Design a protein around this ligand. Structure first.
Ligand SMILES: [Mg+2]
Ligand SMILES: [Zn+2]
Ligand SMILES: [Zn+2]
Lengths: 75, 906, 99, 241
DNA sequence: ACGACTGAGCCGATG
RNA sequence: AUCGGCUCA
């Protein structure tokens, strides 16, 4: 996502929750490592959050359900 | 109370013990500094034993140093050893031996004392300024209350009955007056008093008293604190004590006031309990209280003080107002970091999202981006070691820069930001120089032009800042305009002429009767040098239409288009019909392609396609060998006839002037219509004697062909050159006005191909030196108009999921007798409905399907009619026209509204 | 001209034109109009704190772009702390309520 | 005027020579005469029999000696005034008067502004209504129209304080409805700060940080755009408690 | 009776 | 830093 993000906007729905679904995802892959799924084409953690929306992946439904997973692995 | 997650704010009056709390120690002495060495004196306006020391965890005298003694309450120097920043928050006070009439509660009309005591304003001065007495308590001397008496008489009041009768003097009178005027009393004396003698505008003040009393004790204030019993003083850092350059001392007007004030308060104290000659005193309760009605607010009573240069002294008051306080210092006058500035230049190689940032600039911005992504890659051991490799201009520096600018966008700003497109984001790349580069299409979106201009250049930091700069502010969302349903980024100027030159029709150029085997053979037949961009020929085309669902539609056909036209079909992105480019495309009909490209397909290929027009526009613009020759400034053939037959039509009516078939006064205007007849009698022996001028024919012999003239083509393409401009250039200049307006006896005959008469220049002088003096206040008044308008409709947001009632406002097409502009298809567009679907959108694809019924009589649920708490319900509004979709819960409706009046307010 | 870090004027903790560097660019209210129109929530937060004013957080954010964290961590700009201290000494009570 | 034409329209001040819209419908006839005048009579059959009005001295009229006049007629020529039509008809053609003057300025220059943009503000102008009957505080006064529905939709039901409050209409164009922001923060950024920050002291006014101008100053996030869903989670905890 | 553009440049002069 | 001076968008 350098040219135009039109595919990844309407996936989550609007352009404001393309921020706080990608800000949260741009945060998770910057701190404690975290997995690069769709080939890390050089790029940076900026695009990656959005790039996971361009290939049928990251959403708010997948960031508030999988944060319960890192609360079932540390017991 | 500890945690500082603030939620709400409340305001209230200034009690004595309250302001004392904020204060830590009285500002007893009125001293600044010992003009020997710069140390804030003992008990002076500056002092550490009150406000804290002059450094970090240190003192004045010099035993406690560096850090150790965290909050060690010293004495010899006198410092609670804390970090000096206390001098930005801590306060002192000045206890007045005489109560001092506060001003903001008094001379701010209609007086917060006046209609709180049932009184005017002139009065309260008299006793407080010092001439007369006033009565307080109800007893036995027949003087009741709030009575007024000039000195002399009072002798016979405490010499008749006496004992029960109060009446002191001064501001003090107003003090003790507010003490005993019970408020369970005053209140319930006006609810059965508005019973019959009401009247209709005599009761305009009787309702200004019911509000002010009711809202007072129920907040927990009570009115004793109106007049200032004790005076608060600011912290030392804020009022800046700073000795600049030349052993010389820099301080604003704050200090000059705070002092004198105390110089009287000390003359006062030493003359309250040291013999009180009460006439020599009225020199003091006056002059002291006359300087606090100068500190608090200088210019109110009547331009009281001046500086040392006959110009007013600024005050505590004007530290908020005067457009330049701490209110217009949190929004407007707000300096920002991580940015720069430079002059703007073209960039015809760029793709839309691309700016051309000055390498220099990028570097001195991204410093703390590079330092860290250098230490991480393993090229440096500290931040400072990198501070040398950067400045050394080491090569590896620029390496990291390319991968930092990779996936890290920018904000680009032009003042005035009349609306919101005045800022957009553009993904830059590197380009060396001092100069910044940009797109020539967004030229129009910005208030912009390449001639002597400048752009500040911010940088969005947090992951969010970047991505939301990409998600919203970016240029890629802003192809359609906010204010209306037209794209703002259109083929401006030059890009245009290329396409006209290209597409323009013909019958003879270089050979004809050709066919081609697709769009590819065409390009061969040009750049090599085997044909020209003309020649009407039947051409093979593989247009792919869209299926109902999509998209198994691959059509084939063979149609008539010129060499020029068809070349560009290459860049027309597969999914598009052909009849759009089939013609002599002016910017007018070029903007079509976009608008058609946008709604048939989408956003992702309109951007690619359109930017790729721009290149292809300039491509044949230059190649053309186009120019502005004095040949193509052609004059109408018989110009010196049309002026001449109408010049002797002046000499025929003046055979009738002083006599009588027309009178003396009306002369001025009878010929003005026949003058103005020739105005556009010649402009149609010009757009007819230059419109289709060719006549040199290859194919046997015929006449009709569009002109070879360079200028006209601009007026036919829409490059630049209005059908009024052209006249003035090589036709008729015509009618001008006066400073008043009345037109001149002889409008201009000549033009700018031929030479002007001195008179003829000297007249026009006005015409344009009025029309440009307007522009001295054009950018000024629009900005006053805009702001004002934004400030009413800014406290507003989108709110509910739905507002639900069948209601609205009429739309029935405009007919001013016989002249229409916008009827049904492009006015009622987007309006949300309420009858039959009802409660569904009327899209750009819809009032097509509501024109075919012979549609009449409409009512639509809109913004005024919004049964919606505080905001705009969204489902009872319309559409976000800065997009091709329904409006969304978020985009603040208000800001945009007033914004869209500033933009074309220019 | 350019800017990214340096010094600030004592009172309103903001840049000053003169020695060391030129004038740092200004952010107006008609400029903020644009930020108010776009969803520029987080951007407008940095502007007024970690670029100009904030005394404990503008520079304590500095080493979150160096350290490779990329984050806000703001608090309160002093221009308000001035406005508060002016109003208290102008002659008013005004303060912050909590949860 | 010319350019400040635009200004005057949203500003709200009466123009030069207005008309006389027959305020109430019925058997409208004239009576009496002095120099060149005729005292009008408009008595509705229902309860309010009283009603009389008069006119200046060069108006030529289009209702002669008893014709079917309704809620007014296009009587005397000239540019009409703002305030009365809002009082008379309602709020359906009063807005279209705000639109069908301002626009043609741009339609001679050549600009469109899809009309609903004028509404956003006109709603922010038309607001600040004046209520009829004695309900919770005084006859006339200044209170928001939708606050009068925190009143009218509120009073006519629960509790034990039975006095309904049907609304009436005033126009406060920009510099008038602007003044009446009960939020000292945004209030003092564009008016004479004195007149509010002193009436701030008197009554003990607050500002609970709901606004846009408001949130900005304090170094907080805006309740709009991306900051919308943030201020959906913080303002909801003032009721959950 | 009130209300006074949006950016930054350079010089100068006294609280 | 307030004021004064003058240019370019
Ligand atoms: Mg220009
Ligand atoms: Zn000491
Ligand atoms: Zn609605």
């Amino acid at each position: 996502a350098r040219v135009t993000v039109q595919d990844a906007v309407e996936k989550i729905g609007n352009r404001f929750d393309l921020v706080l679904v990608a800000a949260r995802r741009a945060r998770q892959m910057q701190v404690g490592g975290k997995d690069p799924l769709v080939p890390e084409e050089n790029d940076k953690t900026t695009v990656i959050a959005l790039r996971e929306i361009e290939e049928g992946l990251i959403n708010n439904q997948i960031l508030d359900v999988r944060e319960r997973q890192e609360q079932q692995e540390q017991e | 109370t500890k945690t500082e997650e603030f939620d709400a704010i409340k305001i209230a009056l200034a009690s004595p013990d309250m302001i004392r709390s904020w204060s830590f120690g009285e500002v007893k002495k009125p001293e600044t500094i010992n003009y020997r060495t710069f140390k804030p004196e003992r008990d002076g306006l500056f002092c550490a034993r009150i406000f804290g020391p002059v450094k970090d965890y240190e003192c004045l005298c010099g035993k406690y140093k560096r850090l150790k003694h965290r909050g060690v309450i010293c004495e010899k120097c006198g410092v609670e050893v804390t970090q000096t920043k206390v001098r930005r928050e801590r306060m002192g006070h000045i206890e007045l031996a005489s109560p001092t009439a506060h001003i903001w509660f008094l001379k701010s009309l209609p007086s917060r004392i006046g209609l709180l005591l049932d009184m005017p304003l002139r009065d309260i001065e008299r006793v407080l300024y010092f001439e007369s007495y006033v009565v307080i308590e109800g007893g036995m001397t027949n003087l009741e209350r709030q009575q007024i008496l000039t000195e002399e008489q009072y002798l016979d009041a405490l010499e008749e009955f006496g004992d029960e009768f109060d009446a002191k003097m001064g501001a003090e009178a107003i003090q003790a007056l507010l003490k005993s005027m019970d408020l369970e009393q005053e209140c319930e004396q006006l609810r059965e008093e508005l019973n019959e003698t009401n009247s209709e505008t005599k009761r305009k003040k009787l309702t200004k008293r019911i509000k002010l009393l009711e809202a007072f004790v129920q907040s927990g204030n009570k009115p004793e604190w109106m007049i200032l019993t004790v005076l608060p003083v600011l912290p030392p850092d804020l009022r800046p004590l700073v000795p600049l350059d030349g052993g010389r001392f820099a301080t604003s007007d704050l200090n000059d006031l705070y002092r004198r004030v105390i110089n009287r308060n000390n003359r006062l104290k030493r003359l309250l309990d040291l013999a009180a000659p009460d006439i020599i005193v009225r020199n003091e309760k006056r002059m002291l209280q006359e300087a606090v009605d100068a500190l608090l607010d200088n210019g109110r009573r009547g331009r009281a003080i001046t500086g040392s240069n006959k110009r007013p002294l600024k005050s505590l008051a004007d530290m908020i107002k005067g457009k330049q306080g701490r209110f217009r210092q949190n929004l407007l006058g707000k300096r920002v970091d991580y940015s720069g500035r430079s002059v703007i230049t073209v960039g015809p190689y760029l793709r839309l999202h691309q700016c051309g940032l000055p390498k220099k600039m990028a570097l001195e911005l991204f410093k703390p981006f590079i330092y860290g992504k250098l230490e991480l890659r393993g090229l440096a051991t500290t931040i400072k070691a990198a501070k040398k490799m950067v400045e050394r201009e080491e090569a590896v520096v620029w390496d990291i820069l390319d991968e930092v600018i990779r996936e890290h966008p920018v904000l680009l700003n032009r003042a005035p930001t009349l609306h919101r497109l005045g800022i957009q984001a553009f993904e830059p790349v590197l380009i060396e120089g001092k100069a910044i580069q940009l797109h020539p299409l967004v030229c129009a979106a910005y208030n912009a032009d390449f001639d002597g201009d400048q752009m500040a250049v911010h940088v969005p930091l947090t992951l969010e800042a970047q991505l939301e700069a990409r998600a919203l502010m970016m240029s890629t969302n802003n192809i359609l305009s906010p204010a209306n349903g037209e794209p703002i980024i259109v083929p401006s100027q030059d890009v245009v002429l290329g396409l006209y030159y290209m597409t323009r029709d013909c019958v003879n150029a270089k050979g004809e009767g050709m066919v081609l085997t697709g769009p590819k053979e065409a390009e061969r037949l040009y750049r090599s040098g085997l044909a020209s961009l003309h020649a009407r020929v039947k051409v093979r085309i593989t247009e792919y239409e869209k299926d109902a669902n999509g998209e198994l539609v691959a059509k084939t056909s063979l149609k008539d288009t010129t060499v020029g036209r068809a070349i560009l079909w290459m860049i027309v992105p597969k999914g598009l019909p052909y009849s759009i480019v089939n013609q002599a495309l002016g910017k007018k009909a070029i903007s079509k392609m976009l608008n058609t490209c946008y709604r048939i397909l989408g956003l992702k290929p309109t951007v690619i396609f359109a930017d790729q027009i721009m290149y292809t526009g300039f491509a044949y613009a230059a190649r053309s060998g186009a120019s502005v020759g004095i040949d193509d400034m052609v004059i109408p053939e018989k110009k010196h006839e049309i002026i001449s037959e109408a010049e002797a039509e002046v000499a025929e009516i003046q055979e009738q002037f002083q006599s009588g078939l027309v009178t003396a006064g009306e002369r001025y205007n009878k010929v003005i219509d026949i003058w103005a007849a020739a105005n556009d009698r010649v402009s149609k022996a010009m757009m007819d004697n230059l419109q289709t001028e060719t006549v040199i024919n290859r194919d046997g012999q015929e006449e009709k062909q569009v002109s070879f003239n360079s200028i006209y083509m601009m007026a036919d393409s829409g490059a630049r050159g209005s059908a009024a401009q052209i006249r003035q250039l090589a036709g008729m200049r015509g009618l001008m006005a006066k400073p008043d307006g009345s037109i001149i006896e002889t409008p201009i005959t000549a033009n700018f191909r031929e030479g002007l008469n001195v008179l003829q220049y000297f007249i026009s002088t006005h015409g344009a030196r009025k029309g440009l003096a307007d522009t001295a206040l054009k950018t000024a008044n629009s900005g006053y108009l805009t702001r004002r308008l934004v400030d009413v409709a800014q406290d507003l947001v989108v709110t509910e999921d739905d507002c639900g009632t069948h209601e609205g406002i009429m739309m029935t097409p405009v007919i001013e007798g016989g002249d229409v502009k916008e009827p049904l298809r492009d006015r009622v567009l987007g309006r949300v409905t309420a009858e039959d679907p009802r409660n569904t959108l009327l899209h750009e694809q819809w009032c097509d399907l509501l024109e075919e019924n012979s549609v009449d009589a409409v009512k639509v649920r809109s913004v005024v009619s919004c049964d919606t708490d505080f905001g705009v319900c969204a489902h009872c509004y319309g559409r976000d026209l800065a997009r091709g979709h329904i409006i969304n819960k978020g985009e603040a409706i208000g800001v945009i509204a007033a914004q869209s009046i500033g933009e074309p307010g220019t | 001209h350019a800017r990214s870090t340096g010094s600030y004027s004592l009172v309103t903790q903001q840049p000053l034109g003169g020695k060391a560097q030129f004038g740092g660019q200004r952010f107006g209210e008609m400029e903020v109009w644009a930020l108010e129109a776009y969803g520029a929530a987080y951007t407008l937060q940095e502007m007024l704190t970690v670029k100009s004013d904030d005394v404990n957080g503008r520079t304590k954010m500095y080493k979150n772009i160096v350290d490779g964290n990329h984050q806000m961590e703001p608090g309160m700009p002093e221009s308000f702390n001035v406005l508060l201290k002016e109003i208290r000494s102008l002659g008013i009570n005004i303060e912050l309520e909590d949860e | 005027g010319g350019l400040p034409r635009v200004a005057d329209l949203f500003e709200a001040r009466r123009p030069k020579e207005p008309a006389i819209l027959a305020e109430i419908s019925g058997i409208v006839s004239f009576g009496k005469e002095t120099k060149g005048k005729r005292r009008l009579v408009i008595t509705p059959v229902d309860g309010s029999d009283p009603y009389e009005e008069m006119i200046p001295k060069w108006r030529q009229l289009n209702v002669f000696e008893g014709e079917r006049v309704e809620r007014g007629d296009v009587i005397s020529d000239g540019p009409e005034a703002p305030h009365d039509i809002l009082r008379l008809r309602g709020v359906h053609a009063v807005t279209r008067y705000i639109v069908n003057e301002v626009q043609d300025v741009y339609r001679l220059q050549g600009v469109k502004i899809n009309d609903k943009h004028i509404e956003v503000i006109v709603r922010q102008m038309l607001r600040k209504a004046t209520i009829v009957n004695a309900g919770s505080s005084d006859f006339l006064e200044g209170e928001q129209v939708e606050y009068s529905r925190v009143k009218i939709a509120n009073r006519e039901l629960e509790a034990n304080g039975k006095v309904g409050a049907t609304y009436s209409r005033d126009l406060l164009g920009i510099t008038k409805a602007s003044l009446a922001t009960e939020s000292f923060i945004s209030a003092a950024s564009f008016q004479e700060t004195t007149r509010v920050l002193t009436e701030a002291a008197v009554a003990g006014k607050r500002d609970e940080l709901r606004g846009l101008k408001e949130n900005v100053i304090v170094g907080r996030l805006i309740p709009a755009g991306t900051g919308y869903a943030y201020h959906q989670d913080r303002m909801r905890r003032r009721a959950a408690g």
